[PDB]
């Protein structure tokens, strides 16, 4: 059908893996056109787990992760360790609203088991250390989006929304 997967943008290079299709059909929700990154899907109450990279259940009502969506299935080595769900593309927290969706989604999401064993007192870990972006903008914005650095010159624009808008939180252990 019309498959995708929410991939977040961290400041670690451990999130260059879970994209297989890279195309899906020919479309992608979170697009790049003359204005940078639009359709940023910020998750509520989830945090990231770069080391063994997933999204963790958290409960500070403000806990966000801010990433993107690309039309793909992550690695096919999942569907028990990755979240799979079908909602009619209306329950979304999709910011920088630039496109429209067909009112249905078939998503595949990284996610881990809760493990009520320790204190997961998360930390604000924002997107700094811009050095990571310059391989992020290759491994994803170039190795997935076959138009960045091939049809525009304002690559510093997309290299700026990822500095002010793109952030996240993490369990960080």
């Amino acid at each position: 059908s019309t498959q995708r997967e929410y991939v977040f943008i961290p400041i670690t290079n451990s999130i260059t893996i879970d994209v297989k299709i890279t195309i899906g059909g020919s479309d992608h929700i979170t697009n790049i056109d003359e204005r940078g990154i639009h359709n940023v899907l910020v998750i509520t109450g989830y945090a990231v787990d770069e080391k063994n990279g997933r999204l963790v259940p958290t409960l500070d009502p403000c806990d966000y992760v801010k990433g993107i969506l690309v039309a793909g299935t992550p690695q096919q080595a999942q569907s028990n360790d990755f979240l799979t769900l079908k909602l009619p593309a209306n329950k979304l927290y999709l910011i920088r609203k630039k496109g429209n969706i067909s009112d249905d989604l078939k998503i595949y999401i990284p996610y881990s088991s809760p493990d009520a064993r320790n204190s997961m007192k998360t930390k604000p870990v924002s997107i700094s250390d811009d050095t990571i972006v310059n391989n992020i903008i290759k491994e994803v914005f170039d190795k997935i989006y076959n138009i960045t650095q091939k049809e525009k010159v304002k690559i510093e624009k997309v290299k700026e929304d990822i500095k002010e808008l793109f952030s996240y939180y993490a369990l960080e252990q």
Binding site: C62, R96, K97, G99, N100, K157
Partner: protein, 1009 residues
């Protein structure tokens, strides 16, 4: 000095409940001077609402005399539906400056020499970025959680203007605008192009005139409609800043911040470059100080005429700007076609166009220092003027309403018509002149040849300067039509609506700047004709099966490529334009055409697909007794029991009106202050009638004084007397006291409703014509009417089976994802639905929808349930009409509408019944005869009053025409004894509900022939 209202606005932040008695000005400012309070913002807090005079005279100023750790949140109207603000609070104290940095994220790009921007650009985004912090919408006073915090922060800034008008020495005015004949102006049209653009004309022409106001005084001088979710103010401010000049990255702080809340669609004010929905009310009020802005300062003159004419001149100046902009455009475009005509006529007539096809009234009442003050304080009967002055305004309005000046009575035609001094294009009329087929009340200047050689016939008349322009002529103008100047203006403005921008900005650009910005950008805009919306499913049956059932139609450019750019305000045109089928066809040319018909009728049969239905559905709504609620009466609470006329000497209804406000007022409190009232209220006739009933029980106020004592005196022989006089002037006369907060809250609640029903309409294959605060207008396919109403009514009261765009429609409130905003369940709302042939003149359909619900609201009583007993209400009906088959569905069957927090399924339950019936008629469970056999059971049912006999009669009528024998669909018992008391009118309405349930389905299943 004015425009410093930021501290008048933010006299205390939404952190109010987070500085009041635990659960954690504490912060005054970091980017302005010090907020002064000698009596300056004192008055702004005390006179803005009743919460400072309802609960005593000092408690609200102390914010600690009846405190409590839990903070309720009540509806302003029916204080029974609760919400709790709990622990979650504005972002942490340690980061309370970060949000201020989030404050300062776009207030530092343009010069700070002027406040006419630095005060109002933040106004509209104040509420926005704050709900991004997800503040959860605290109330203003926790001892009275009836007004949310932001609402009072704006209501105080409202009458701050009058504060400053007394700060000069004295002045202050309540000005009200209202265009004269709307429902008449809208009537003129032929294809719904003219319909929607005449609506948009009313809207934009009234939007032009108050731009000047918000530029001389800044917003929050306006009361109605609230400049909160204005789809027009949004675009206006936005383009103001865009012309100020900032990177799309610099405005991107505001662009998405709007589109996610307001304009929840995709095609928006930046793809049509125009707001796709007209939302301005044809009437708007203003609280105006006596100051005058002409540069560098604000001077005053003591007169009232300084506005009565200075508003009329602006209203007509907007029309002049528009007409000259159309002159420039048609000149710049004669080389196309049909624009040669517009130029030719705007040159053949210029003086008739020197007067706008609308009119307005303007009344403007005053205020002074006398009896609002004595030296520096507020006396007895000082909180008792604003609503007084408001009533004065509305009394002037409804007095002048007795006369009606139609716009044409302004035109100077006498010479132009007595002699052949009138210019005619086409056939110089044998009979001296003709009337335009659109107005029928003006002499037309363009008279199309009806039809004999339409190609040559008008090339035979020099109107067609050559063989080419005939297409662009014959397109926008149907054969045989006749156009007056005023309606050729609208046919032109329907050729493209982008020129309405000249009206939007209140002369912010120059006119040439606008028209020459839009001669560069070149894009086609389409408007859904009745023939389109009468084919929605016909395209869906051809969208799912694109060419599967399309092979011969693959050449008729309907099953072919959408070619250039076509985009519509119609949301269902934004979500099927790229489905491969061009929604730019003219269905009156393929199958709604005559010659190409029988072919298609034998074509669709082999693909087993239906003949289309020649019927749309003109839905319009109305809020029953809205004016009384704004005035502050209880007819909205008792729609039908009491009328306006039963307010001349209200002392007879001292049973109803004296109830139903107590239970609101006496309950509007909480904690302990509630008891403070829960005793003091009835002690008038229940007690010694004077200020000694409460003095006995007053002490439970002074039973909390000494922990951090601040008060100056405890001798309250006044705050018992004043809290008695307050309720005495309002139960001796059982009205409510109106506040700026009241009005602004209601207008805001109307704007949230605007958004939500804008999402409702186009949730179905709808097409808004005018979404208003308390009204609506649309065209829907005859399949999506009931289900629409059933929610739109419910949604109006505040109830969601769904998230609409991103708004949570809870029970009683409309919560924007943390912001619980109050809806209007107590307000009634009637509906009027016309099932119209596509080949019906819109003039008549609009007239007989407006008058249908116009007199239907004022004529039809039904048996209702008040206080448990049986009464006869008069409003909240849902009228239908096919062509002579009228039907009426009530909607509440209770008074007040939802007196309990779970009464929210009493509403529109009957349409649930009709849905469960219609759903099963066609599934082959129940025969078609169910609606032909009721004419055999109707008499017994209406002659019965033993509801189980009636239940068995209905069960028998259901069972005797069942296709199976095993369907058991039963009607509720309460829908048995109600009776539709219509009286003395040549209209035909069955006098019992189930007959109307039958006739509604008669209509709807008939709207498919």
């Amino acid at each position: 000095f004015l425009d410093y209202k930021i501290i008048a606005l933010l006299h205390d932040p939404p952190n109010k409940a987070w500085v009041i008695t635990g659960r954690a000005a504490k912060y005054i400012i970091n980017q302005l001077f010090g907020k002064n309070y000698s009596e300056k913002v004192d008055n702004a807090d005390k006179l803005a609402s009743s919460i400072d005079r309802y609960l005593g005279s000092i408690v609200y100023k102390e914010r600690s005399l009846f405190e409590n750790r839990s903070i309720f949140l009540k509806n302003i109207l029916l204080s029974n539906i609760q919400r709790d603000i709990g622990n979650l609070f504005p972002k942490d104290k340690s980061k309370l400056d970060n949000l201020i940095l989030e404050y300062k994220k776009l207030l530092n790009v343009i010069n700070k020499t002027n406040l006419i921007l630095k005060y109002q650009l933040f106004y509209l985004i104040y509420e926005l970025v704050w709900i991004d912090s997800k503040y959860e919408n605290t109330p203003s006073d926790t001892r009275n959680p009836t007004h949310t915090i932001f609402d009072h922060l704006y209501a105080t800034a409202a009458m701050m203007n009058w504060i400053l008008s007394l700060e000069k020495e004295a002045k202050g005015y309540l000005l009200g605008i209202d265009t004269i004949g709307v429902a008449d102006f809208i009537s003129k049209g032929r294809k719904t192009r003219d319909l929607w653009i005449s609506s948009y004309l009313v809207s934009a022409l009234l939007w032009y005139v108050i731009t000047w106001f918000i530029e001389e005084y800044g917003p929050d001088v306006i009361l109605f409609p609230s400049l909160r979710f204005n789809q027009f103010y949004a675009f206006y401010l936005l383009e103001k800043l865009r012309k100020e000049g900032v990177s799309e990255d610099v405005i991107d702080e505001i662009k998405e911040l709007i589109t996610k809340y307001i304009f929840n669609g995709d095609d928006l004010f930046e793809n049509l470059k125009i707001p796709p929905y007209p939302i301005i009310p044809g009437r708007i009020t203003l609280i105006l100080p006596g100051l005058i802005r002409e540069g560098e300062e604000y001077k005053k003159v003591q007169d009232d005429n300084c506005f009565i004419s200075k508003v009329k001149e602006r209203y007509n100046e907007g029309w002049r700007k528009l007409i000259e902009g159309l002159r420039c455009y048609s000149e710049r475009k004669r080389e196309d076609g049909f624009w040669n005509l517009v130029c030719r006529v705007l040159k053949l007539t210029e003086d008739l166009l020197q007067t706008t096809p609308l009119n307005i009234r303007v009344k403007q009442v005053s205020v002074t220092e006398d009896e609002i003050f004595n030296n520096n304080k507020l006396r007895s009967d000082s909180w008792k003027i604003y609503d007084n002055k408001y009533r004065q305004l509305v009394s002037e309005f409804k007095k002048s309403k007795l006369v009606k000046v139609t716009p044409e009575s302004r035109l100077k035609l006498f010479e132009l018509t007595k002699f052949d001094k009138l210019p005619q294009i086409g056939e110089k009329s044998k009979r001296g002149y003709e009337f335009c087929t659109s107005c029928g009340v003006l002499p037309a200047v363009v008279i199309m040849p009806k039809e004999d050689e339409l190609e040559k016939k008008l090339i035979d008349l020099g109107i067609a300067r050559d063989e080419k322009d005939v297409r662009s002529i014959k397109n926008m103008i149907s054969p045989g039509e006749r156009l007056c100047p005023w309606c050729l203006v609208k046919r032109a403005l329907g050729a493209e609506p982008r020129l309405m921008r000249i009206l939007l900005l209140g002369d912010l650009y120059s006119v040439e700047k606008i028209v020459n910005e839009i001669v560069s950008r070149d894009v086609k805009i389409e408007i859904p004709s009745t023939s389109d919306i009468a084919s929605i499913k016909t395209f869906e049956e051809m969208i799912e099966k694109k060419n599967e059932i399309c092979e011969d139609l693959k050449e008729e450019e309907v099953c072919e490529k959408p070619s250039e750019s076509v985009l519509s305000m119609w949301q269902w045109f934004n979500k099927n334009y790229y489905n491969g089928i061009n929604l730019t066809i003219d269905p009156e040319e393929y199958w709604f055409s005559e010659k190409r018909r029988r072919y298609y009728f034998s074509v669709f049969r082999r693909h087993r697909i239906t003949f289309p239905s020649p019927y749309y559905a003109l839905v319009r709504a109305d809020s029953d007794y809205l004016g009384d609620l704004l005035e502050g009466k209880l007819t909205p609470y008792l729609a039908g029991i009491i009328d306006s006329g039963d307010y001349a000497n209200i002392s007879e209804k001292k049973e109803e009106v004296n109830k139903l406000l107590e239970e609101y007022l006496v309950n509007a409190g909480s904690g302990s202050i509630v008891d403070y009232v829960k005793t003091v209220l009835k002690c008038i006739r229940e007690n010694l009638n004077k200020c000694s009933c409460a003095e006995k029980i007053y002490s439970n106020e002074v039973a909390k004084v000494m922990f951090r004592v601040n008060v100056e005196k405890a001798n309250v022989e006044e705050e018992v007397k004043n809290s008695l006089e307050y309720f005495e002037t309002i139960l001796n006369e059982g009205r409510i006291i109106v506040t700026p907060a009241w009005h602004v809250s209601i207008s805001s609640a109307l704007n949230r409703g605007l958004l939500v029903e804008l999402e409702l309409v186009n949730k179905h294959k709808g097409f808004v014509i005018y979404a208003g605060g308390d009204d609506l207008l649309a065209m829907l396919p005859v399949d999506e009417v009931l289900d629409f109403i059933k929610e739109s009514r419910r949604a109006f009261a505040g109830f969601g089976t769904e998230k609409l765009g991103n708004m949570c429609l809870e029970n009683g409130f409309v919560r924007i994802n943390n912001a619980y905003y109050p809806s209007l369940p107590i307000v009634g709302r009637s509906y009027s639905v016309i099932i119209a042939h596509y080949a019906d003149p819109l003039f008549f359909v609009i007239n007989d929808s407006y008058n249908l619900l116009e007199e239907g609201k004022e004529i039809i009583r039904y048996r209702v349930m008040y206080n448990g007993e049986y009464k006869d209400a008069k409003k909240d009906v849902a009228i239908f009409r096919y062509q002579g088959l009228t039907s009426v569905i009530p909607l509440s069957l209770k008074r007040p509408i939802v007196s309990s927090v779970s009464d929210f399924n009493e509403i529109a339950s009957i349409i649930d019944v009709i849905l469960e019936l219609k759903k099963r008629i066609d599934e082959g469970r129940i025969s078609v005869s169910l609606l032909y056999d009721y004419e055999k059971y109707k008499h017994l049912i209406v002659a019965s009053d033993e509801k189980y006999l009636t239940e068995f009669l209905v069960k028998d009528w259901i069972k005797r025409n069942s296709l199976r024998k095993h369907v058991e669909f039963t009607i509720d018992e309460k829908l048995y004894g109600v009776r539709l008391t219509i009286e003395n009118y040549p209209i035909k309405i069955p006098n019992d509900l189930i007959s109307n349930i039958v006739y509604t389905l008669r209509i709807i299943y008939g709207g498919e022939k």
